[PDB]
Amino acid sequence: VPKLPCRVDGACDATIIKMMTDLNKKGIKVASVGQNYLISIPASALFADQSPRLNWASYSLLNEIAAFLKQFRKIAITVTSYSSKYVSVKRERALTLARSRVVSEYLWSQGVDSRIIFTQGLGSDKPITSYTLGGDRSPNARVEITFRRAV
């Protein structure tokens, strides 16, 4: 009983629910249907105006991302990048792929407890809002992280 652990290390349900509350009142979307979990983040707090560069203050948000990813036990993570149609299909797709690549690389540099990370982006291929008035301020342009909790 001291020879065997009583909990998975670095995990408390109180911490999990309070940080979920903190991210939800931050405004980034956290969702859990079944045994799967996915989160959505707008581009306005991560990138510049359709540009693949990171603001400095976003590192705290990605630290919160890392702290929440410390909690569970995971195997396969997938990121996805969506945007708004700006000039070229190639340009939007490449920008989404680059943003997915760079956030995947920083997540991998941080202590991710996984074996497989997938990265892809699709531009403005599947919008979820007919209100397409805004650009990068619009909620259509975003990034999603999705995975399945593993036992």
């Binding site: 020879k3 065997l4 652990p5 009583c6 909990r7 998975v8 995990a11 408390c12 349900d13 109180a14 629910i17 309070k18 909790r149 036992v151």
Partner: protein, 78 residues
């Protein structure tokens, strides 16, 4: 000590995953049966990765592994 703190509490221990279930439908962070996937990466003992401990009463201070080996670490120096 509450494995389902900040929720309703313990519902029951499922044995097929060896885990408690909280009163909201989430898997708890603790365990209840030994047939769960712990990530244990540390051990004790000597003659490991070998025949193991020979149950003979050694008059000397040495210990013989059952494949024919000897652990001078577990043995006593002079």
């Amino acid at each position: 000590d509450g494995c389902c703190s900040k929720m309703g509490g313990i519902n029951y221990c499922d044995s097929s995953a060896g885990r408690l279930v909280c009163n909201n439908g989430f898997y708890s962070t603790c365990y209840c049966t030994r047939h769960a996937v712990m990530d244990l990466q540390f051990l004790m003992g000597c003659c490991l990765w070998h025949g193991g401990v020979y149950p003979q009463l050694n008059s000397s201070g040495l210990v013989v592994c059952n494949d024919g080996y000897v652990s001078e670490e577990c043995s006593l120096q002079k």
